[PDB]
């Protein structure tokens, strides 16, 4: 019931490139607040790179920072927040779990929204872990593979063809 955790302003058009990362954040507010936090942290860092001075962008980022400060406080004594190494592993491993879920569906020839979303979200989470520093080679490889699969399978199903 912290007011700072209430919804943000509408996303500025300048920040279109982080719309899906922010959506991922909010879909995890209950499910996994650690993921919710770091997705917002990435959105904040990326948004500042893009535009922190245009009034709408400055206002949006100011509210996002309010929400980050509140959420960090509320997460309290959480290892994945107090220890960057653990936070990075938490996100990397959550990405890997949905990646391997989607891979298992793919290998079985089971194509559906959930595994498409799992591939795509895995790729978004690898974007997010750039907040911890340089990506590993395997990070780069997984993000590319996952986003390719999400796009490819989606397009095939849209056209009625088996991937």
């Amino acid at each position: 019931s912290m007011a700072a955790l209430a919804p943000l302003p509408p996303l500025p058009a300048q920040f279109k490139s982080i719309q899906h990362h922010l959506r991922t954040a909010q879909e995890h507010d209950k499910r996994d607040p650690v993921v919710a936090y770091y997705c917002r942290l990435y959105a904040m860092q990326t948004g500042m790179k893009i535009d922190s001075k245009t009034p709408e962008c400055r206002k949006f980022l100011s509210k996002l920072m309010d929400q980050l400060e509140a959420l960090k406080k509320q997460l309290g004594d959480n290892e994945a927040i107090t220890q960057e190494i653990v936070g990075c592993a938490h996100l990397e491993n959550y990405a890997l779990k949905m990646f391997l879920y989607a891979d298992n569906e793919d290998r079985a020839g089971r194509f559906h929204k959930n595994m498409i979303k799992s591939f795509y979200t895995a790729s978004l989470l690898i974007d997010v872990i750039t907040v911890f520093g340089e990506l590993t080679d395997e990070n780069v490889k997984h993000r590319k593979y996952a986003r390719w699969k999400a796009t490819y399978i989606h397009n095939c199903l849209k056209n009625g063809e088996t991937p």
Partner: peptide, 14 residues
């Protein structure tokens, strides 16, 4: 840019 938002951002990471 080095502004007040980036300074608040750095404080989160401390």
């Amino acid at each position: 840019d080095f502004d007040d938002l980036s300074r608040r951002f750095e404080e989160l990471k401390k």
